[PDB]
Amino acid sequence: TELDYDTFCFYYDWYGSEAIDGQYRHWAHAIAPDPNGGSGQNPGTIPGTQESIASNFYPQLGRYSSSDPNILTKHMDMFVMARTGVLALTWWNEQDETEAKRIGLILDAADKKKIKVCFHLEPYPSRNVQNLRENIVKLITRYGNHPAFYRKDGKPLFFIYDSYLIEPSEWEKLLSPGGSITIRNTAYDALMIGLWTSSPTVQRPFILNAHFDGFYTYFAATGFTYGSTPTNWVSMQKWAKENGKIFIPSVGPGYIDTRIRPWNGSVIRTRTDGQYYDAMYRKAIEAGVSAISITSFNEWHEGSQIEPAVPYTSSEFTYLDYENREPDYYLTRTAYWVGKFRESK
Numbered sequence: 043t044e045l046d047y048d049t050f051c052f053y054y055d056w057y058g059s060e061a062i063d064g065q066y067r068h069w070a071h072a073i074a075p076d077p078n079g080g081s082g083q084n085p086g087t088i089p090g091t092q093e094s095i096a097s098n099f100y101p102q103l104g105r106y107s108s109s110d111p112n113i114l115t116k117h118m119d120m121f122v123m124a125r126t127g128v129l130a131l132t133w134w135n136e137q138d139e140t141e142a143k144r145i146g147l148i149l150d151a152a153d154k155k156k157i158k159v160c161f162h163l164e165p166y167p168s169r170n171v172q173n174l175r176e177n178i179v180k181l182i183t184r185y186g187n188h189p190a191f192y193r194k195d196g197k198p199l200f201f202i203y204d205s206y207l208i209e210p211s212e213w214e215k216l217l218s219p220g221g222s223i224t225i226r227n228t229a230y231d232a233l234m235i236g237l238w239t240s241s242p243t244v245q246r247p248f249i250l251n252a253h254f255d256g257f258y259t260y261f262a263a264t265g266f267t268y269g270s271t272p273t274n275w276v277s278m279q280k281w282a283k284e285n286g287k288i289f290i291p292s293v294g295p296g297y298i299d300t301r302i303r304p305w306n307g308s309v310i311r312t313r314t315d316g317q318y319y320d321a322m323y324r325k326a327i328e329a330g331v332s333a334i335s336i337t338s339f340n341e342w343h344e345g346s347q348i349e350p351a352v353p354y355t356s357s358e359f360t361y362l363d364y365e366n367r368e369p370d371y372y373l374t375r376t377a378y379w380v381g382k383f384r385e386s387k
């Protein structure tokens with residue numbers, strides 16, 4: 043029954059409905075050009091109609107709005123069902139007051155069920171260490187006193203997606219104790235969790251020289267990177283422990299993004315009735331880590347979601363579904379692994 047507060051589930055608040063947002067945002071989505079394709083590609087778009095959404099799966103809740111209070115209550119009950127104590131909220135620096143209202147709604151809904159919220163800092167336009175500092179300050183100032191705001195031993199925690207886009211010489215200005223714009227030992231200090239992608243030869247000095255407090259791996263597809271290859275996790279944890287870093291491996295129930303990335307079929311990982319998820323979660327537990335991240339609650343575009351999905355077929359597409367499992371199976375199976383994680387933590 044207890045929620046686990048070292049289990050972080052990646053959450054996306056970008057979905058819209060006609061009724062609430064005036065358009066089916068994200069259910070409608072651009073199809074991505076092939077990176078190795080020609081020069082003048084015209085991939086098209088997915089309209090976000092009932093028949094055709096930007097996912098290989100279909101949500102039980104339909105084409106929902108992330109701002110719908112009814113949807114928010116349902117998602118928070120699903121977090122409770124999954125025993126996942128922390129919602130890791132995608133954050134794109136939209137800056138409009140709509141973003142603020144939405145974050146406020148999520149924090150209020152989370153706190154009713156004693157869920158905590160931390161921020162997942164995305165590669166927003168012109169992201170750099172100076173505006174990242176400004177934004178961390180704004181987020182802590184604005185939300186740091188909310189009861190649902192996540193802290194570990196007094197410290198806020200931020201996941202930094204695609205952190206490699208900013209060189210360690212830049213990171214050190216923000217994250218070194220002697221950094222020219224440091225947050226260390228200020229009111230705005232936080233646990234900063236960077237993305238580990240490739241081999242230890244590159245990643246080890248990256249993490250040390252950038253002064254991250256920890257690292258995560260994000261990708262739900264096993265083998266996509268060195269960091270998302272679970273057999274590496276024991277050795278990654280031993281390095282983390284040796285160097286005083288927090289390792290938060292990411293586990294997911296599967297992966298498929300071919301509706302929006304039709305050229306990306308080699309990254310597909312089938313769910314095989316839960317067997318994929320079991321194998322990956324088990325590997326994280328066996329690595330003896332102190333925290334786990336789940337990719338994802340509701341990244342519907344990438345087919346990594348544990349949110350309940352239903353069978354559905356339209357003239358546009360035959361959606362995948364949870365096969366010989368109920369719509370809520372990945373929630374309850376998450377709860378099962380969280381219990382196992384807790385027993386040996």
Ligand SMILES: OC[C@H]1NC[C@@H](O)[C@@H](O[C@H]2O[C@H](CO)[C@@H](O)[C@H](O)[C@H]2O)[C@@H]1O
Pocket residue numbers: 132162164165203302341343344
């Ligand atoms: O949260 C980290 C990372 N997760 C996978 C994606 O959600 C990615 O965003 C990119 O891809 C999505 C579609 O899957 C697209 O909507 C978004 O605009 C891209 O930035 C995200 O950064």
